[PDB]
Motif scaffolding. Structure first.
Motif, PDB file in Angstrom:
ATOM      1  N   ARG A 162      12.321 125.012 -31.521  1.00 21.56           N
ATOM      2  CA  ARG A 162      13.554 124.259 -31.609  1.00 21.56           C
ATOM      3  C   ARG A 162      13.885 123.537 -30.312  1.00 21.56           C
ATOM      4  O   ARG A 162      14.321 122.401 -30.372  1.00 21.56           O
ATOM      5  CB  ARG A 162      14.717 125.192 -31.934  1.00 21.56           C
ATOM      6  CG  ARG A 162      15.964 124.499 -32.473  1.00 21.56           C
ATOM      7  CD  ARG A 162      16.866 125.507 -33.172  1.00 21.56           C
ATOM      8  NE  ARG A 162      18.110 124.869 -33.517  1.00 21.56           N
ATOM      9  CZ  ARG A 162      18.445 124.412 -34.725  1.00 21.56           C
ATOM     10  NH1 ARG A 162      17.685 124.600 -35.797  1.00 21.56           N
ATOM     11  NH2 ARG A 162      19.582 123.768 -34.843  1.00 21.56           N
ATOM     12  N   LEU A 177      14.184 119.616 -30.769  1.00 24.72           N
ATOM     13  CA  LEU A 177      15.448 118.902 -30.595  1.00 24.72           C
ATOM     14  C   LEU A 177      15.227 117.578 -29.874  1.00 24.72           C
ATOM     15  O   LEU A 177      15.893 116.560 -30.160  1.00 24.72           O
ATOM     16  CB  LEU A 177      16.415 119.704 -29.731  1.00 24.72           C
ATOM     17  CG  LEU A 177      17.155 120.881 -30.343  1.00 24.72           C
ATOM     18  CD1 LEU A 177      17.733 121.723 -29.217  1.00 24.72           C
ATOM     19  CD2 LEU A 177      18.283 120.490 -31.271  1.00 24.72           C
ATOM     20  N   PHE A 220      19.130 114.372 -26.063  1.00 23.56           N
ATOM     21  CA  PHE A 220      18.535 115.487 -25.352  1.00 23.56           C
ATOM     22  C   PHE A 220      17.373 114.973 -24.519  1.00 23.56           C
ATOM     23  O   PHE A 220      16.463 114.385 -25.077  1.00 23.56           O
ATOM     24  CB  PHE A 220      17.993 116.541 -26.304  1.00 23.56           C
ATOM     25  CG  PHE A 220      19.025 117.306 -27.080  1.00 23.56           C
ATOM     26  CD1 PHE A 220      19.850 118.223 -26.449  1.00 23.56           C
ATOM     27  CD2 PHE A 220      19.100 117.207 -28.459  1.00 23.56           C
ATOM     28  CE1 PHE A 220      20.784 118.956 -27.163  1.00 23.56           C
ATOM     29  CE2 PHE A 220      20.019 117.962 -29.172  1.00 23.56           C
ATOM     30  CZ  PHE A 220      20.855 118.836 -28.529  1.00 23.56           C
ATOM     31  N   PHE A 225      21.181 117.711 -22.006  1.00 18.82           N
ATOM     32  CA  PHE A 225      21.513 116.448 -22.658  1.00 18.82           C
ATOM     33  C   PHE A 225      21.180 115.275 -21.749  1.00 18.82           C
ATOM     34  O   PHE A 225      21.028 115.430 -20.533  1.00 18.82           O
ATOM     35  CB  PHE A 225      22.979 116.467 -23.053  1.00 18.82           C
ATOM     36  CG  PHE A 225      23.272 117.456 -24.150  1.00 18.82           C
ATOM     37  CD1 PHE A 225      23.475 118.793 -23.863  1.00 18.82           C
ATOM     38  CD2 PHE A 225      23.362 117.049 -25.464  1.00 18.82           C
ATOM     39  CE1 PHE A 225      23.726 119.704 -24.875  1.00 18.82           C
ATOM     40  CE2 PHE A 225      23.647 117.959 -26.477  1.00 18.82           C
ATOM     41  CZ  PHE A 225      23.829 119.275 -26.182  1.00 18.82           C
ATOM     42  N   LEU A 275      28.051 116.301 -22.750  1.00 22.37           N
ATOM     43  CA  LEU A 275      27.611 117.651 -22.595  1.00 22.37           C
ATOM     44  C   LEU A 275      26.475 117.653 -21.580  1.00 22.37           C
ATOM     45  O   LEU A 275      25.826 116.610 -21.370  1.00 22.37           O
ATOM     46  CB  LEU A 275      27.215 118.201 -23.965  1.00 22.37           C
ATOM     47  CG  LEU A 275      28.329 118.125 -25.012  1.00 22.37           C
ATOM     48  CD1 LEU A 275      27.855 118.593 -26.374  1.00 22.37           C
ATOM     49  CD2 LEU A 275      29.550 118.922 -24.579  1.00 22.37           C
ATOM     50  N   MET A 308      22.718 123.813 -22.474  1.00 25.21           N
ATOM     51  CA  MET A 308      22.984 125.049 -23.206  1.00 25.21           C
ATOM     52  C   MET A 308      21.807 126.006 -23.059  1.00 25.21           C
ATOM     53  O   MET A 308      20.706 125.623 -22.729  1.00 25.21           O
ATOM     54  CB  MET A 308      23.289 124.822 -24.687  1.00 25.21           C
ATOM     55  CG  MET A 308      22.654 123.591 -25.286  1.00 25.21           C
ATOM     56  SD  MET A 308      23.057 123.603 -27.048  1.00 25.21           S
ATOM     57  CE  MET A 308      22.204 122.135 -27.625  1.00 25.21           C
ATOM     58  N   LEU A 349      23.588 131.548 -28.370  1.00 23.65           N
ATOM     59  CA  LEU A 349      24.017 130.488 -27.481  1.00 23.65           C
ATOM     60  C   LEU A 349      25.075 131.175 -26.632  1.00 23.65           C
ATOM     61  O   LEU A 349      26.133 131.463 -27.162  1.00 23.65           O
ATOM     62  CB  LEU A 349      24.603 129.384 -28.375  1.00 23.65           C
ATOM     63  CG  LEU A 349      25.408 128.260 -27.750  1.00 23.65           C
ATOM     64  CD1 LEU A 349      24.657 127.550 -26.639  1.00 23.65           C
ATOM     65  CD2 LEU A 349      25.840 127.266 -28.812  1.00 23.65           C
ATOM     66  N   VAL A 407      29.294 123.134 -24.071  1.00 25.39           N
ATOM     67  CA  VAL A 407      29.729 122.990 -25.474  1.00 25.39           C
ATOM     68  C   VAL A 407      30.661 124.149 -25.856  1.00 25.39           C
ATOM     69  O   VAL A 407      31.641 123.947 -26.559  1.00 25.39           O
ATOM     70  CB  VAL A 407      28.561 122.864 -26.471  1.00 25.39           C
ATOM     71  CG1 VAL A 407      27.594 124.039 -26.411  1.00 25.39           C
ATOM     72  CG2 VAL A 407      29.083 122.676 -27.887  1.00 25.39           C
ATOM     73  N   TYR A 417      23.222 132.980 -34.098  1.00 27.71           N
ATOM     74  CA  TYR A 417      22.535 132.493 -35.274  1.00 27.71           C
ATOM     75  C   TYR A 417      21.526 133.550 -35.724  1.00 27.71           C
ATOM     76  O   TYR A 417      20.887 134.182 -34.898  1.00 27.71           O
ATOM     77  CB  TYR A 417      21.827 131.172 -34.978  1.00 27.71           C
ATOM     78  CG  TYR A 417      22.662 130.133 -34.277  1.00 27.71           C
ATOM     79  CD1 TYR A 417      22.895 130.224 -32.914  1.00 27.71           C
ATOM     80  CD2 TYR A 417      23.157 129.027 -34.946  1.00 27.71           C
ATOM     81  CE1 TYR A 417      23.643 129.271 -32.245  1.00 27.71           C
ATOM     82  CE2 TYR A 417      23.910 128.069 -34.294  1.00 27.71           C
ATOM     83  CZ  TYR A 417      24.146 128.189 -32.933  1.00 27.71           C
ATOM     84  OH  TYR A 417      24.865 127.248 -32.254  1.00 27.71           O
ATOM     85  N   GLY A 465      29.553 122.302 -35.541  1.00 28.45           N
ATOM     86  CA  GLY A 465      28.366 123.097 -35.411  1.00 28.45           C
ATOM     87  C   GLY A 465      27.411 122.910 -36.576  1.00 28.45           C
ATOM     88  O   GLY A 465      26.275 122.496 -36.380  1.00 28.45           O
ATOM     89  N   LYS A 524      25.895 119.441 -36.662  1.00 28.82           N
ATOM     90  CA  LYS A 524      24.864 118.936 -35.737  1.00 28.82           C
ATOM     91  C   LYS A 524      23.483 119.424 -36.152  1.00 28.82           C
ATOM     92  O   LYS A 524      22.520 118.660 -36.090  1.00 28.82           O
ATOM     93  CB  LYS A 524      25.139 119.294 -34.270  1.00 28.82           C
ATOM     94  CG  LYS A 524      26.229 118.491 -33.571  1.00 28.82           C
ATOM     95  CD  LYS A 524      26.218 116.966 -33.738  1.00 28.82           C
ATOM     96  CE  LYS A 524      25.101 116.187 -33.091  1.00 28.82           C
ATOM     97  NZ  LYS A 524      25.403 114.736 -33.118  1.00 28.82           N
ATOM     98  N   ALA A 525      23.427 120.672 -36.599  1.00 30.06           N
ATOM     99  CA  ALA A 525      22.248 121.333 -36.965  1.00 30.06           C
ATOM    100  C   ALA A 525      21.678 120.814 -38.288  1.00 30.06           C
ATOM    101  O   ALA A 525      20.472 120.586 -38.408  1.00 30.06           O
ATOM    102  CB  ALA A 525      22.595 122.773 -37.073  1.00 30.06           C
TER     103      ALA A 525
HETATM  104  O1  2AN Z   1      22.118 123.405 -31.388  1.00 31.74           O
HETATM  105  S1  2AN Z   1      22.423 122.541 -32.483  1.00 31.74           S
HETATM  106  O2  2AN Z   1      23.778 122.877 -33.269  1.00 31.74           O
HETATM  107  O3  2AN Z   1      21.416 122.664 -33.492  1.00 31.74           O
HETATM  108  C1  2AN Z   1      22.521 121.043 -32.123  1.00 31.74           C
HETATM  109  C2  2AN Z   1      21.695 120.199 -32.834  1.00 31.74           C
HETATM  110  C3  2AN Z   1      21.665 118.823 -32.637  1.00 31.74           C
HETATM  111  C4  2AN Z   1      22.536 118.215 -31.787  1.00 31.74           C
HETATM  112  C5  2AN Z   1      23.427 118.976 -31.061  1.00 31.74           C
HETATM  113  C6  2AN Z   1      24.221 118.321 -30.156  1.00 31.74           C
HETATM  114  C7  2AN Z   1      25.122 119.030 -29.439  1.00 31.74           C
HETATM  115  C8  2AN Z   1      25.202 120.402 -29.540  1.00 31.74           C
HETATM  116  C9  2AN Z   1      24.417 121.170 -30.335  1.00 31.74           C
HETATM  117  N1  2AN Z   1      24.715 122.475 -30.461  1.00 31.74           N
HETATM  118  C10 2AN Z   1      25.980 122.919 -30.689  1.00 31.74           C
HETATM  119  C11 2AN Z   1      26.057 124.286 -30.945  1.00 31.74           C
HETATM  120  C12 2AN Z   1      27.285 124.878 -31.217  1.00 31.74           C
HETATM  121  C13 2AN Z   1      28.434 124.118 -31.238  1.00 31.74           C
HETATM  122  C14 2AN Z   1      28.371 122.781 -31.038  1.00 31.74           C
HETATM  123  C15 2AN Z   1      27.144 122.165 -30.773  1.00 31.74           C
HETATM  124  C16 2AN Z   1      23.458 120.444 -31.179  1.00 31.74           C
END
Ligand code: 2AN
Ligand code: 2AN
Ligand code: 2AN
Ligand code: 2AN
Ligand code: 2AN
Ligand code: 2AN
Ligand code: 2AN
Ligand code: 2AN
Ligand code: 2AN
Ligand code: 2AN
Ligand code: 2AN
Ligand code: 2AN
Ligand code: 2AN
Ligand code: 2AN
Ligand code: 2AN
Ligand code: 2AN
Ligand code: 2AN
Ligand code: 2AN
Ligand code: 2AN
Ligand code: 2AN
Ligand code: 2AN
Ligand code: 2AN
Ligand code: 2AN
Ligand code: 2AN
Ligand code: 2AN
Ligand code: 2AN
Ligand code: 2AN
Ligand code: 2AN
Ligand code: 2AN
Lengths: 159, 163, 159, 162, 159, 159, 159
Positions: free
Chosen positions: A27, A31, A39, A59, A65, A68, A86, A91, A101, A136, A139-140
């Motif tokens: 992942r 990403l 990213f 990022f 951001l 993470m 996480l 974030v 998760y 959340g 985005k995923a």
């Molecule tokens: O890791 S993911 O959610 O897959 C993710 C996937 C794709 C884009 C993302 C961009 C910002 C934050 C993430 N995480 C995030 C996690 C928790 C809360 C808010 C954002 C992003």
């Protein structure tokens, strides 16, 4: 201890070991393959690729951001099982302590099935963002659908 | 019921690096086709005559002419392609050698890491008051394992072949 | 049945993360740098370095030997703890079903200490003598030595 | 070199007894039904592990004068609801030295106010030694005669397990 | 979409295999033994101790709440894990679709460790009463103990 | 033109051959056993009990209704299926040529699940008083529930 | 909740091994053949030409609707008996959830006769508009009428 939770199920034409490698083990790297506009890089800073492994997702410099970190709680690639967390990164903000998760996959044809569960662990006497949660899964889910499409069309990837 | 004719059963336990969907397909569903592809010197062709590649399906597996044998007839008794299950029976063809009523193949696979686990169980069924040759059994299992082992190497080698 | 058990307690100037990496986690790839006159290749044939991982070490063409596949059982790298199985390969004689190594290091100042618990298990089809169980030991003691020299003279490696 | 043999008997049967009835008598409660039908051959039978479900094990004992003495059985798979069970005769003196274990699959189905059953029984040989008809026919006839015995009492008593 | 989750860890001096039979496996009947004043009946509508077991409760006629119904998602009886959901009841107010019970215990010394998760899934559009949460814990906790001590005072119970 | 058919699905602790017998085959005779304040007599006026058989069911005197005749169109007892139809009686008002009944039952553990379909056919150039359907189901379901309780108490009826 | 049921018995000179295919098995490709102006595309995106398959007919640019999806509750391509459900698509007005079509073709010499049961099932409290039935009954009968021609026209096809 008021924790908001999203437990859902999905289904794909993509194979389950493949999708797991893509969405769980790799992942941090994937990403950056799917969203180069968001990213800048994705690595491991602690671990050898199994339980206890710690990743750093950074990022682009123009994104609000910064980075993470996630840690691997349990991993059983044998049955497509992993629970990660996480535990550091902007974030999160100040209202959240760590987002956990737990993913469970399984083959259903040449494709897959999975039980994904997200749980937000708030800081003492804070309100978990109901909005932070919609953001959340948003985005995923996009990411997962974006990967699914690369893979579909590039069947040799992670096959 | 002086007797319910005794039958001969082999229970196998086998494992591949090949993902259970590629194997469910290569060796169960399209087996009829993959045989001739894999062993084009023994079998000229395989072709589903009845049904539409699902349950109760029957295929005709055809040997070459010089080859002792000619055609093999398989009937599909149970399938759950989702869960890689299948019962398929061998009934029409001289591979039996005019003595076996049928051979009952039961197959169940499951994913592991990047590969498969496998439940195979073969059962030989004779026609009224005949012997179940150990011979044929030695050969029913040996030709298939060889078959299996050739198709594994292919699919390992050519990783996009089945979908 | 009953097996032969070599148990040991060795001490080393190299730090334990340097030995754990060199002699447990990357052993297979380190056996070829050090004994390239014996081994052609080391590789993981399946696994994420986790727990169900399997590596393959191949001997050189001329070597009487051909190959070994090792399969980790459980790990705690952080603690330098590993139990790993030698389940098949040319090296196993008919008398041996497998050989079980149980590794656990700790720090001793700028150096390390470690207990080893190598076990030769046989097949019901045969019995275990001491000539072979004594060789394994030599092979693997001599290996480390060759490596100690290396981890000492090049402190950058796995530090 | 090859995969060892084992001997299977497939049967298909039809009863005019409702099927939940016979699932209680020759399957879920075989161990107690065996004694009531044949107190002449059996002294007792009973559970020793579980409470009827998957993994449940039972023990069978023949009178002091019988050339056999006991029999153990484990329940592998129970789906009572559709009348399917898989159980294993894995310990007792009934296993002549060649036999390792006996596996029994049974499925039953409704047919009017009665039923239809498909029973498959698989004998598993032990390393080296070989199985033969001896243990089998005898095994086939024992189970069948019992059931007929079951069938005649279940009919003669409508409210028993009904 | 989002559910209120309650994660609870406590630990009680009783062998897991003994709580297990009381606080979950036969929790239908022993719930009256516990409160023969708030609870009228304890019943298993269907399931032979089989996963997918569904019980039936009813408080004494006086009590404003009629009954509670549970299905058992899975039971690792051998492993002392269970997942169960509250799927129907008067207690199940008109704004909660279901309350999920994830309980896992394991032996610790001569005692047990209690971590359980309960999730509150709200019927479409509703926020779900945060009251039913605080309440849910207190009622099934108070009962937690009663059953502890009793079992503590009788070592022969469900041995 | 199009008619109204209400597709129902129900569950009884009673075995299908019991349900089927009581609620279908000797139904004409049970209606009087279960409801002797409503009914006077049940009989067959044109049939042997096989397909195309007709029953005559009189209501007690001083009752709005007078009688009803049904014909058994399809009978596959082995699989517990039946197709019968009410085509005569003051219970069928001016509208509707024939409301049709289709019962399909299945064995399950000690009991049975059912599938029933009632197809209300409007009278030549009319509408279906979809308030007679609400009325039809009730009485047929009580009749049922009364028979259910009756058969559970006395497990020798239709064995 | 009541439902609207159609009992239509038709006839046709055209041979049933062609109609049945056209009218049922290959309807998705043929709808799109007889009325290119109403539909631009139609395909099978799930199942495999058997019971449980799902079809996707795609109305052209200029249509209120753009697609609908059908499921084959039952197929019997030798006795000319089918039972497919219209589950999803825009056509289903808020008051309609699905339409169940039961078809049976019989051989009358060089042609066929038939029985089609169309039954519209309403959603939770909603009720079907008389409108909703005559629409469906007509563009479909009409379709059938164009094919009676299409086929008769040319025995080359579907023979
Ligand atoms: O890791 S993911 O959610 O897959 C993710 C996937 C794709 C884009 C993302 C961009 C910002 C934050 C993430 N995480 C995030 C996690 C928790 C809360 C808010 C954002 C992003
Ligand atoms: O191919 S991989 O990097 O393996 C890859 C793996 C998984 C998902 C991917 C998504 C988008 C692009 C990729 N590659 C890519 C190709 C060209 C430019 C940028 C990215 C993806
Ligand atoms: O952290 S690493 O950067 O791989 C690392 C680098 C170099 C040597 C290491 C030795 C042991 C364990 C590590 N990591 C580890 C991390 C998490 C769990 C278990 C082991 C080592
Ligand atoms: O639309 S999708 O990618 O399919 C998508 C699919 C499925 C679920 C989604 C959930 C939240 C947000 C999306 N947002 C989103 C936001 C911007 C661009 C793309 C998606 C979701
Ligand atoms: O964008 S999508 O998720 O595709 C989307 C699709 C359909 C309906 C939506 C409704 C609200 C917010 C969305 N997205 C959203 C995305 C980012 C931030 C906030 C809201 C919706
Ligand atoms: O997409 S999400 O569920 O949002 C998602 C979120 C977080 C981690 C995920 C890991 C693997 C697969 C996902 N999806 C997935 C989808 C379909 C089938 C199997 C897994 C993950
Ligand atoms: O995926 S869906 O489940 O429909 C879905 C779920 C939630 C939000 C979505 C937003 C936009 C598009 C969707 N579908 C979509 C599908 C494939 C690719 C891109 C978007 C959304
Ligand atoms: O490529 S072949 O040489 O035929 C071949 C040779 C040997 C074994 C094979 C097994 C599966 C598929 C093949 N080919 C295949 C080709 C096209 C479509 C699908 C499968 C195999
Ligand atoms: O065992 S084989 O003899 O090749 C075999 C023989 C006969 C039928 C088979 C069907 C599927 C898979 C096989 N082998 C298999 C092997 C490993 C994993 C899964 C299936 C079959
Ligand atoms: O006979 S088997 O190996 O069983 C056999 C089975 C099936 C197909 C065969 C095709 C060629 C040669 C064989 N064997 C062979 C045997 C003796 C001499 C030369 C070839 C075949
Ligand atoms: O076993 S099969 O996989 O169908 C098979 C696979 C590959 C080659 C075979 C050659 C001859 C006969 C077969 N069947 C057969 C069956 C029973 C007895 C003897 C031979 C062969
Ligand atoms: O024994 S078998 O299990 O069949 C067997 C199975 C699979 C592959 C084989 C390869 C070579 C010899 C075998 N044995 C053999 C023995 C005699 C004649 C031909 C082959 C093989
Ligand atoms: O370098 S080599 O010359 O191959 C080498 C030669 C001889 C013995 C060695 C022992 C350990 C690691 C090495 N190399 C190594 C290099 C990079 C990373 C980790 C280990 C050894
Ligand atoms: O088999 S691998 O080739 O690595 C592999 C390749 C691609 C995807 C995989 C996903 C899960 C587990 C694997 N392997 C694995 C192996 C051993 C133990 C646990 C997991 C995957
Ligand atoms: O011991 S190992 O450390 O794997 C080993 C290390 C280095 C060289 C070796 C050469 C041959 C065999 C090995 N294994 C072996 C195993 C058991 C008995 C005898 C030799 C070697
Ligand atoms: O080979 S010999 O030295 O003869 C030898 C003989 C007897 C026992 C041995 C044990 C371990 C290593 C050896 N060699 C070794 C070589 C270099 C460094 C450390 C040990 C042993
Ligand atoms: O002892 S050796 O004989 O090399 C040896 C033999 C067999 C397995 C070993 C595994 C890890 C470390 C070793 N040596 C070691 C040396 C110093 C400290 C800790 C471990 C092993
Ligand atoms: O368990 S039954 O078959 O039901 C059985 C039923 C009735 C009487 C029996 C007497 C002895 C042994 C049994 N079992 C047995 C098993 C294998 C071989 C021979 C006898 C008897
Ligand atoms: O087949 S028997 O050998 O008696 C038999 C043997 C062992 C177990 C059996 C279990 C249920 C029913 C039988 N007979 C049966 C007969 C008619 C209808 C339904 C079941 C059983
Ligand atoms: O007399 S019985 O004891 O049942 C009986 C028990 C065991 C084996 C039998 C074999 C043949 C006929 C019997 N009689 C028979 C009776 C009715 C139908 C079929 C066979 C057998
Ligand atoms: O349900 S609650 O709404 O918390 C509840 C409310 C009031 C009294 C209760 C008494 C016992 C158990 C409860 N819950 C419970 C849940 C599962 C199993 C057994 C008891 C009670
Ligand atoms: O009610 S309170 O003291 O508010 C209370 C406060 C906080 C936590 C509680 C947990 C369990 C039971 C309570 N009450 C309770 C009262 C009487 C009998 C049994 C349990 C709890
Ligand atoms: O449905 S029945 O079960 O026969 C039924 C059973 C018992 C009492 C009934 C009384 C009135 C009308 C019925 N049926 C009826 C049927 C169609 C339209 C209107 C009334 C009664
Ligand atoms: O019942 S219809 O409304 O026509 C009808 C509507 C929709 C689909 C149909 C498919 C096959 C036959 C029909 N009937 C039929 C009847 C006579 C001749 C040709 C077809 C279908
Ligand atoms: O003429 S139709 O056959 O409907 C027709 C067929 C194909 C495409 C059409 C596009 C717009 C309007 C239509 N007519 C229409 C008429 C009434 C209501 C809505 C649309 C179209
Ligand atoms: O015209 S259609 O294109 O079907 C049509 C399309 C869309 C909505 C319609 C509503 C009512 C009647 C129609 N047609 C109709 C046709 C003949 C007689 C009575 C009504 C509608
Ligand atoms: O569209 S109208 O004729 O107005 C029409 C109006 C009202 C009801 C209809 C029913 C079926 C077919 C129609 N048309 C049709 C047209 C050509 C051939 C066969 C049937 C109907
Ligand atoms: O699918 S058919 O009826 O054959 C059909 C055939 C030809 C054209 C159609 C146009 C619109 C809607 C249909 N169906 C429909 C069905 C039920 C409700 C509403 C519309 C059409
Ligand atoms: O559409 S046609 O232009 O005839 C046509 C043209 C070319 C190929 C065709 C193949 C099958 C059916 C057709 N037509 C068809 C038309 C109406 C009903 C059913 C089939 C084909």
């Amino acid at each position: 201890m008021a924790a908001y939770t999203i437990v859902k199920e999905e289904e794909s034409p993509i194979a389950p070991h493949r999708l797991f490698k893509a969405l769980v083990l790799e992942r941090h790297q994937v990403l950056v393959k799917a969203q180069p506009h968001v990213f800048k890089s994705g690595e491991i800073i602690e671990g050898d690729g199994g339980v206890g492994t710690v990743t750093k997702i950074t990022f682009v410099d123009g994104h609000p951001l910064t980075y993470m970190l996630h840690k691997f709680d349990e991993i059983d690639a044998a049955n497509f099982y992993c629970k990660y967390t996480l535990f550091e990164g902007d974030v999160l903000r100040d209202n959240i302590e760590k987002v956990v998760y737990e993913v469970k996959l399984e083959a259903v044809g040449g494709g897959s099935k999975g039980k994904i569960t997200v749980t937000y662990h708030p800081k003492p006497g804070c309100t978990v963002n109901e909005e932070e949660v919609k953001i959340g899964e948003k985005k995923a889910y996009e990411f997962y659908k974006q990967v699914e499409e690369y893979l579909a069309a590039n069947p040799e990837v992670f096959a």
